[PDB]
Amino acid sequence: LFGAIAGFLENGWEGMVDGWYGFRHQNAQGTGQAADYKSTQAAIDQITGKLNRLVEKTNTEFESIESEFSEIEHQIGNVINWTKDSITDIWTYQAELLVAMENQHTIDMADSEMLNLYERVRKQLRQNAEEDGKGCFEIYHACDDSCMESIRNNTYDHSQYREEALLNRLN
Amino acid sequence: LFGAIAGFLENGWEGMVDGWYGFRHQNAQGTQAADYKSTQAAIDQITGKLNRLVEKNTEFESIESEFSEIEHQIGNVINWTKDSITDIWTYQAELLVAMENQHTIDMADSEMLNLYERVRKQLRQNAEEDGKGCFEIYHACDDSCMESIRNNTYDHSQYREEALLNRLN
Amino acid sequence: LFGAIAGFLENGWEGMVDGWYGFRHQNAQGTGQAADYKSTQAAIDQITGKLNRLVEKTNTEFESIESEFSEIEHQIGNVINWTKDSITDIWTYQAELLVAMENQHTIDMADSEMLNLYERVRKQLRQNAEEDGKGCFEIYHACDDSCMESIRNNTYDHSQYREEALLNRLN
Amino acid sequence: DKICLGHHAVANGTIVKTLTNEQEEVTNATETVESTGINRLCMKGRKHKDLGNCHPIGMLIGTPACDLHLTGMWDTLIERENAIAYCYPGATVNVEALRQKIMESGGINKISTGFTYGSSINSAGTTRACMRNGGNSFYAELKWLVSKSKGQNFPQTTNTYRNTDTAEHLIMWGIHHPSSTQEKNTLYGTQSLSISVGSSTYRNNFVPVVGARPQVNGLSSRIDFHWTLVQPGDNITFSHNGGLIAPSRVSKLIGRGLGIQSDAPIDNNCESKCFWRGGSINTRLPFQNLSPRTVGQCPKYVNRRSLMLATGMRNVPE
Amino acid sequence: DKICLGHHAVANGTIVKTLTNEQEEVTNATETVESTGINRLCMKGRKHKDLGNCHPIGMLIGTPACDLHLTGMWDTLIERENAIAYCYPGATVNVEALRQKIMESGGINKISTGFTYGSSINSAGTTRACMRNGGNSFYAELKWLVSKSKGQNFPQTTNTYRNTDTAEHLIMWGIHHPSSTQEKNTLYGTQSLSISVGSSTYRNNFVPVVGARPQVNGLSSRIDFHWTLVQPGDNITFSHNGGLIAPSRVSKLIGRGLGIQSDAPIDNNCESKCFWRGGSINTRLPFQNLSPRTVGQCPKYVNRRSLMLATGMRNVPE
Amino acid sequence: DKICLGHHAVANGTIVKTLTNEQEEVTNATETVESTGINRLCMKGRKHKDLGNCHPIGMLIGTPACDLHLTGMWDTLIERENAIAYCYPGATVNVEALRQKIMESGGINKISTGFTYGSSINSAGTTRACMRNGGNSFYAELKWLVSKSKGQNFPQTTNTYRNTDTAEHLIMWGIHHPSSTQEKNTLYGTQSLSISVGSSTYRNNFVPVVGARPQVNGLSSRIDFHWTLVQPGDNITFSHNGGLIAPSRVSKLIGRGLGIQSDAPIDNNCESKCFWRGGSINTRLPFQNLSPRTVGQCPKYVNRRSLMLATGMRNVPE
């Protein structure tokens, strides 16, 4: 667990329907919402990679060893019965583990990309902002829609506003 | 591996029999507590693994006779099958606890780091990390204040300006 | 995934051969590259354990139930085929799941070991440095080559340069 | 001025199991176990034989139900419920082993033994248990031999079939077991009867035995069927003086095919690789719960109704 | 002013295996491989039959060891080592499959054949080898047919069992193989013997063969048992000459049950679902290393003494 | 002033497989599926026995090709592809189970029966099919009994072998099936032929099946072999009319060793524990793709050319 999804983020945005991960902002102009392509594709690329492994078919032909319409000798039938049940017990265990092991890693991977998106933004904002604990960053300079976009564009230049932010933080 | 256990935190606390994860005081007049939610968060995952482990059973009957001889060739087929079925269940079972113990360990780790980060984000600018698990709080924190830190009700705004110029001098 | 490798770090260093993980430094004196022993060995030892588990297998003795040079009876030979092919399908499955699962874990752990070095350095540097988000720490005091190795050895004292560094961060 | 971070959620989120939690709620999930199949036998792309009425055994000895299936080529062979092997009541030694072999074949070809009998033998016994076109008849590949003059001792006769081919042949014969002393005497005489068969790989003796039995297909008598493979270049000889149901053609099984026992109707438009009693299975999933008995290239049968694989993150609603 | 975060730890940790490290100290752990079973057969809640020194086959045939196991209803059947099947020396053809049937069953009911024999047949013969109340006796369910006047030709006899029920019945009979030519001549006559047995789905011939054999139970003679299932509404007919150990009751196997081969003592207080040659196994764990050879609902046998599952964090002490 | 953290990478890197990614690139990796095996049988530290043309069955009956293999001790047995079991036409009933027991054994010992025949019997007959040193010879461990005076009835004979050892002995014998009635009459007389074998646990009768007159055909002269195991303290009695091919010695299979069927030349300098028809497998890897059919302590066979395991981090090149 990386502490983000169902961790310090209180809940999910049902409103966000264009991505797995996103931004919501607030400034004077108003409030917005956008979705982050990179990180969602990272997560969905890793899911669809799992599903291909799932669907790798392995073509081993099998014939019939127990008749459906005729009598089979009692002793060989109990041997076939024991073997076949034993293989099914194996494959039932193998499937149930597979799904449980995969799901655990699917959840936590989805968690990590959220925390990787969050971390990138924190490092970008630098000393011009502070974390509020609920996954938000409080910014100490005016940031208009074209600036908020530069945070999502990954092109936000922290040194531009560094003078104004630092003065607001310290008073 | 999340860094906290066998990582930046030096060692375990034996005096803490109260819970898995905990806090320790340093202030004038005072000095231990365990965190409830973060230990349940870990115990509830251990007993999750345990409940899976004890799941069940297919009924099997006898296919080699214990008190009589049975034909040589069918006997060799039956020895081979069971032996192969055991090589499998033995492999499956040394894999199960191995990758289970890896997850269990690395998960307890995880829950410790999440307590750490939760508090870090809460002290905010009023404190800094010593890198050994501790936060040096650049202001005065009586026993009530340290309660509130363990409470997730600490208000950083209360002390920010007094704390800030303290960090700068 | 912990976000350091193939993450916020943009690429690995071919130039470094002394280790898995290392530092590059710039100061008045010049460039340097040195590997970290503690960390490239915490991660290497973990790999070796994986190898021991892999080859530390002691095997059951199996005799021959299928005759190479003479015709075996038809019904029982068919039962033997079905069982061999079934046991083989399972081991093929197991072997592909082991490798994929171990590979995912190996890569993520390496990522973990890297980030862990970063964190120890970031905490150590404390309020005398800042992060650029591509893996470096810009240092707000002049760091001597002797001071640089204090960072690698965990010798750096932060209190020593605190007054001096806070001043250059703030101006 | 602040920017926030977060993730999507949905109103109805599917539940999946995890290693530590069996009630985990996730945004999306998909099935790994196939629970539906085709109630047809998808035989497109396959040269196939639907035998219907014909039991695979019936093919070698020529039961009338099998007249359409005496010789063939196929890559798939289909046996149907309640197929007929025996017109005249009987049983075959190592019956399952032979049936399995035919089901593994990719065809049958028939070769005449070439047997000829003197004037004392009547080669053409028939019965109403083996009807063929409103007419009494007999297994098409075997000949029932009886004395021409009733009650007179069947003559001592020697018959040899030589396999002059490059591959083994499957020869079959029967031993007739009468239902009464009267009938045995009428058919073969009062003499003591012996039938001995042998090749380089086979030696045996058979003796018809008279005992009363329940009527099956109206007959109290029986025929036991026997068989052996006759290698290329080898000969098999029958020495007999009453009671041999002798082969008039031998068989040759050819190549390899997949045998299928099924209740399903054929569909030549769909194509598939996995089959069972109920029909065919076309799927991508590694596991299934339709049948514990499948055939072909099939997913692995698991003992679970459903196993769901997470396609999304944890679902935390708004 | 500081505040410090920490994790617990314990004085002595338990070691566990992980993917990268044998020897990983952990605060707690719990064994996942059961290693101790119970040295008793825990039969609580089961309506069970302990055969003791009675062998399964002997229930059918009526060996004196089984005189208290000739019928019944059970859900668990226990067979003991060295159990007795034959008082008169001999063997059963196809014994292991017969024994498995019986051992898969839930009961036995006995149905009389009703066979009766005319005056030239003495059907009450007994032997030294089958003792009841200290004197000569025979299998309770078979009868030894001999000529009443020693030396004379045992008469051509017919006997028909008719399954008037709606389940199948099991029928056993013995063939007698004398020790010398005088014996055979005295018991059955100088004539050549034959025993034919036929139903709708069964036929066989048998011939008593005279031979010298090591004395077992004081007898160089041998009774060799045979058996077949008789379907509802079908009949089975014995045409015999001399040499038939004739059935006077048939059996009807009924329902299902778990068959346990063990010498452990019964104990009606503990309860179990899993059993081996040593006593029961009761455990919650999924793996056990007591026996690779169990019956019923058992944990899976793994070839290891221990597999410890971590139940707490890494142990890091001062 | 800066200080950076970083990781190594390599100009050339391997590609591995992951849960989420098929094409992942890592700094270093190793093979987990062995694909090379040694083409010789590595016997270092194994007392072995290389049969060559001797077939294991021939060891028991003393076929001339096995004269240097009538006895010995081994912990490994090697059988070769075209090995000779029989000098004279015929075969063994239940041959595979028999072959398997010899292959499971740790050596063979021979023990004389002590059989001894009256003046009426000629016990020294040989044949142009079994040649020893350019002379007519017979299977070493048996003896073809015929009437001393030709055409006179073979005397009624009894032979008993008494196992006075502490282990089980394996005893083999043959039945001779003559080419014609004239040959059978000459050898054994005109009497009806019977051969009875019996222990405390074994009972069987054999009658020779005489052939028909042309020499080339399937019904010619042959000798087929039958076997069984005799327990300690037990005697097996042969009561016979002629047509028995009597044992002169019986075998005692001893201890346990591993049987290898293989084409491969011995290499007495390298060591190994896993074998297959092609050679040996020496590896630390847990999987192999060389052979589905292995004997001994082997890695599991997997249907994959290559499974690479990661031994370093992701490779991100500059």
Ligand SMILES: *[C@@H]1O[C@H](CO)[C@@H](O[C@@H]2O[C@H](CO)[C@@H](O[C@@H]3O[C@H](CO[C@H]4O[C@H](CO)[C@@H](O)[C@H](O)[C@@H]4O)[C@@H](O)[C@H](O)[C@@H]3O)[C@H](O)[C@H]2NC(C)=O)[C@H](O)[C@H]1NC(C)=O
């Ligand atoms: C299994 O054994 C059964 C017992 O033998 C066989 O059943 C018998 O088959 C014969 C011939 O097919 C039948 O015989 C005839 O009976 C009628 C008169 O039938 C009516 O009167 C009798 C006497 O009171 C009564 O029992 C019947 O139910 C009828 O009401 C005569 O006209 C004929 O000449 C001839 O004698 C038997 O009736 C029949 N028995 C039964 C109980 O059905 C059966 O065939 C055997 N099964 C097999 C597979 O062969």
Ligand SMILES: CC(=O)N[C@@H]1[C@@H](O)[C@H](O[C@@H]2O[C@H](CO[C@]3(C(=O)O)C[C@H](O)[C@@H](NC(C)=O)[C@H]([C@H](O)[C@H](O)CO)O3)[C@H](O)[C@H](O)[C@H]2O)[C@@H](CO)O[C@H]1O
């Ligand atoms: C014909 C006959 O047996 N009469 C006398 C012989 O019994 C007796 O020899 C002794 O025979 C003993 C075996 O006897 C039984 C037996 O218990 O096994 C006696 C049974 O009544 C008889 N039953 C039937 C149906 O025949 C039974 C049977 O014949 C045999 O089992 C077939 O082998 O034999 C025992 O073997 C003694 O060792 C033996 O001396 C001889 C000599 O006293 O005199 C006969 O009058």
Ligand SMILES: *[C@@H]1O[C@H](CO)[C@@H](O[C@@H]2O[C@H](CO)[C@@H](O)[C@H](O)[C@H]2NC(C)=O)[C@H](O)[C@H]1NC(C)=O
């Ligand atoms: C099958 O029967 C044929 C005819 O009896 C056997 O054929 C011949 O072998 C003899 C001896 O080698 C030759 O003189 C003949 O010229 C062969 N016949 C022909 C036309 O090839 C043959 O040997 C038998 N097969 C076996 C296995 O014995």
Ligand SMILES: CC(=O)N[C@H]1[C@H]([C@H](O)[C@H](O)CO)O[C@@](O)(C(=O)O)C[C@@H]1O
């Ligand atoms: C070869 C021969 O004899 N054919 C006759 C048979 C047999 O004699 C019996 O089936 C043997 O018992 O009996 C019939 O009644 C029949 O079956 O229809 C008439 C037929 O002409």
Ligand SMILES: *[C@@H]1O[C@H](CO)[C@@H](O)[C@H](O)[C@H]1NC(C)=O
């Ligand atoms: C084998 O098992 C199937 C179902 O378990 C059953 O219907 C059949 O009776 C069993 N066969 C034998 C030989 O016991």
Ligand SMILES: *[C@@H]1O[C@H](CO)[C@@H](O)[C@H](O)[C@H]1NC(C)=O
């Ligand atoms: C979840 O997966 C199913 C199958 O891929 C798909 O139908 C669905 O659109 C996905 N659900 C979403 C997009 O939430």
Ligand SMILES: *[C@@H]1O[C@H](CO)[C@@H](O)[C@H](O)[C@H]1NC(C)=O
């Ligand atoms: C074997 O023969 C010996 C000598 O006659 C005899 O002592 C012994 O009782 C016989 N064995 C059996 C079991 O009959």
